[PDB]
Symmetry: D2
């Protein structure tokens, strides 16, 4: 493993609809985005079937729910520009056609929802800097001009809200270390300078908030194990030391907070099966990795259902989408075995960063 | 203080719009509902001014945001039936006229949002039982028939979601004790039997969730001090003992979780000023009560702004609405002094339960 | 229940020998101190049998282990002066005769071990002030002169070390409130002024340290329920609000930290049986009281064995000493039923404070 | 760094006397054990001066306080047998001459105090197995015969009590992994089988208990960073995954629990200065390493004074003993700079394990 490697990513993007039904977005062999959704917001629900958005795309799709409940998808087009399309009403399967946001992007798009209800998109630009564009009014198809935040990115960006509403963005830099930059006031265009968090990383960063309000960042390290760092104060400049966990992982990690408020991390393990680790107590030590039966061909994508149950999506060896879930809304629940969401095969359309 | 007393309630109901701007609803001297809203989602924002909904009402209004971002208000009419009106689009100040939901109600209405996106309303009925009615599809003006959950209520009901999506409802019973009843599966019409939590209470119950997922209930006790009880397991049947805190309070309490994940409680104190107490550590002991200058004439109503800052609304001695807020997004922030939201005077339209 | 009442106390004092065998001290119908000890440091051990110290006493005996492992007992004599006697070697049943420390005392004695190895005794004096006397060298029969700390005491004193080695003393004052006073530097004769913790109490105070280093104080309140308060900072002046727990208790409480670091409290309940409550999580909420079968005639005295198992001693209706213990070294262990430590009957020799 | 390396150890062993004065034991250029002690139990106390025990030794000395307060030192002699000598009374500077315990030992000795007051010594034997010998009565010069616990050791052993009084012993095995073995009942000669904790380690293991009762083990790993693992249940068989902390260390670590109950770790860092890291919250994340000025030539040895203040001892470049300490009994206290405990120079007499 080399310092500039980027671990295998998830094969779909997932979102909860306004009524919390899960909906997945991926790219098929026709290079178009397809999507599928639960018919009811429970993991054992039937799925509607795969439906196509017309248009050829050249990145992994990113999806986020607007503050009025409508899903909106962002993707790079054949012109290397940003395109988006949206549900025309919450919980409806009527969509716009792809609409242009222009620009020139060289990474997958990352979408955040500001705490004033406005979507904001972060991408690597043609000059390898971080660029962003935002809705100028909440849940409205009115966007700003493109603006640069500088820097030099060698991974996809990952964005998350701090507890006080300030967006913070994480990305690997030219030295293969994790860097970050943040709004200095909530949902405004006033930003810090770039700062290094020092450690080399070999995956995109994955960010989650704990109960205490503080951000935690997970990534694969140079020795191919999971490592993590967390905010220790009230601001974006006070961080812990990095810690690693034993166990070689072969994909990006995926993190989720269970309904007991504890963190869980999923990743493809050294034997190409799905591995899971969880915090055993508040802030506590981490469990040994547990493995699920079955070889997988992507990183996991993890979501929560309306009753709190965790559900995991992966690419199978047959190049189709599989999933499994918790049988009960309990931290020690047993899990189902992999089930197929059949109808199309999927490709990894992630932008090749080099 | 007698066992059947119900402490003074808050004078307004508050909600966050889809873009997180606060909006308050109260009843004026014309017995109509009026509302006012922030023009931007920050506590130092200007307010738009008081606007009237036509129609005479006979209860405190209850407000909740739909899963598509539209606010919806519920109130008892002059016919003792339930009426509602809604924003016709998220973050817009265009409303329906009051529309009928019928029934016969003898308490203030309480509204909950199920985790599948459907609003559900709980009221005491003409037979003193708990009744409820729900949207049959998420964020849609299609409602069920009225259905009884039984029991005998001597307070307004308070409802909250468990971490697994099950609604749980709390209300004082015929013996002046706190009782509760819960969905046995998330967002379904399958309910438990009524169970007593034993302690006498002299206010409506106030329910909040902690980070661990568990519900905590606050109420005034028979000796006029604050008392509280919390779930200790994974279900609705395992509760702690009751604990009281020293200090006589003269209103219902209001509880909020700050951005550090700790709980804070506000109440009118024995000297008729606003009092505040907070948890000093995770699950920790509670601080001595702190007082704010100024005599108040209602219980506090507490809300959070888009940047996490807590804001408190009270009725002043001039019968107008006043508010104060935290100066910074920090747990140890200083507070502003009371400021007026002028333009109308307010009355307490709470249903007299005896 | 009146504000000046002092709840029933424990009938024996207990200590661990240098090898951790438990040894109990009580007063029999001959007004002499008798003692009995485990033959091995396990709760199911046989006991040696009751042995008498010659001499008539007029208070409950207090016992503490010296820093060289020798037990030492303190008691008021027929002359109202303080007397003491000691093991002449650790884990040996050879004792000195009662030896005089003079003074004039009007409460039971309370003994503390300073963190520099010197015993220090606290008593109410003939002028109702707090007085103390100390070893001038660790584990040596060389004592200081008597010195007054002032104040007005209406309970027995309770002393405990802070985490930094400063002794802090708690006692009810003339206004029936809990007061305290503390060393301002570890194991030195430099003391603070008296300060009130405000709440009325109707038992002696009981003090324990939690894992965080902080002191917690338990007492019965004016409504005959358990109440407690805890340090919230790094010093002796920052305390939480008082909290009460529901449930009427009819004796002083006894507190212990179990081997999981959680606190447990035992007391005689409203039905004259032994009641137990425990913290369900770190700093967490408290369980409902659980009852053990059997009417008891004293407060419990609680100790821990060499394997961590909790053991409880009480006076039975037959005026003899009974005990029960945990069956395993686990927080959720079951308990044995009461067993007799037969051979003498015991009287409550506690000094009548009025 | 190779898998079989054993990091540099501390240059002295330290103990608290019965009155909590610190006393240090090391080996000088004459191959004899010398010791020095505080004259009062405070870090700014003067020290008595270096005093010699007659006799040539061939290991680092181990010291433990007996349950009657007397210090006792264990060391390998020129005959490769175990020898010991003891204070003849607590807090006295009168010692026995070295007395024989025989055996054949190939590591430094490790001493534990059972919870029934009996010392027990663990050593690697001439067959590379773990051997032990124990006092047959508490604080008495009567010892058992030597007994083997089997295994194959490639480090010195480290022993610690579990919260329930069971001794647990940790040592590196033939595969360079950390192994452990434990008493299955407190202070009895009934032991488990050896079990692997799997990770390679390149230092002796260092064991400490947290507040929750659970053991935590620290060691240097194969990549020369600090790693740690902790018990997650009520027994000796349930452990967390291993975690590493960033930062190359060049000595064994030393761990201590501060008076707030949080853990701190000291080690020589990659630049040969003393480094310190601490837990920022309960169980929490670990701080970045902080450095103290001054090149050091051993691992640190860490102790606590009677007022809770941490004190650290190291070998200086002048081959003399230096120390520094906290200025106040507070977790965020500043520290003094290195001060000399002059009078002799010290050598590292640690047994060469290969």
């Amino acid at each position: 493993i080399e310092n500039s490697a980027i671990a295998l990513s998830g094969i779909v993007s997932v979102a909860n609809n306004a009524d919390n039904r899960l909906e997945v977005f991926g790219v098929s062999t026709d290079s178009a985005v397809w999507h599928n959704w639960q018919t009811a917001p429970l993991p054992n629900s039937s799925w509607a079937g795969w439906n196509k958005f017309n248009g050829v795309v050249t990145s992994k799709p990113a999806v986020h729910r607007n503050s009025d409940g409508r899903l909106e998808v962002f993707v790079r087009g054949t012109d290397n520009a940003l395109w988006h399309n949206w549900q025309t009403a919450a919980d409806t399967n009527t969509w716009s056609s792809w609409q242009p946001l222009y620009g020139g992007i060289t990474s997958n798009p990352e979408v955040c929802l500001n705490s004033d209800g406005r979507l904001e998109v972060f991408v690597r630009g043609s000059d390898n800097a971080l660029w962003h564009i935002w809705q100028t009014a909440a849940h409205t198809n009115s966007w700003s001009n493109w603006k640069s935040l500088g820097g030099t990115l060698t991974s996809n960006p990952a964005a998350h809200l701090n507890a006080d509403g300030r967006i913070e963005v994480f990305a690997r830099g030219a030295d293969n270390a994790l860097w970050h930059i943040w709004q200095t006031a909530a949902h405004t265009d006033q930003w810090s300078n770039w700062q290094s968090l020092k450690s080399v990383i070999t995956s995109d960063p994955v960010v989650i908030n704990n109960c205490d309000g503080r951000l935690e960042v997970f990534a694969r390290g140079a020795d191919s194990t999971l490592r993590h760092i967390s905010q220790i104060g009230s601001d974006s400049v006070s961080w812990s030391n990095w810690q690693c966990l034993d166990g070689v992982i072969t994909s990006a990690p995926a993190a989720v907070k269970n309904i007991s408020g504890q963190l869980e991390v999923f990743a493809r393990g050294a034997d190409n099966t799905l591995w899971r680790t969880w915090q055993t107590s508040h802030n506590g030590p981490w469990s040994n990795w547990s493995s699920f039966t079955g070889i997988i061909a992507s990183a996991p994508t993890v979501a929560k259902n309306s009753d709190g149950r965790i559900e995991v999506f992966v690419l199978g060896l047959d190049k189709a989408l599989w999933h499994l879930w918790q049988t009960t809304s309990s931290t020690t629940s047993s899990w189902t075995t992999w089930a197929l969401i059949g109808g199309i095969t999927l490709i990894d359309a992630s932008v090749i960063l080099e």
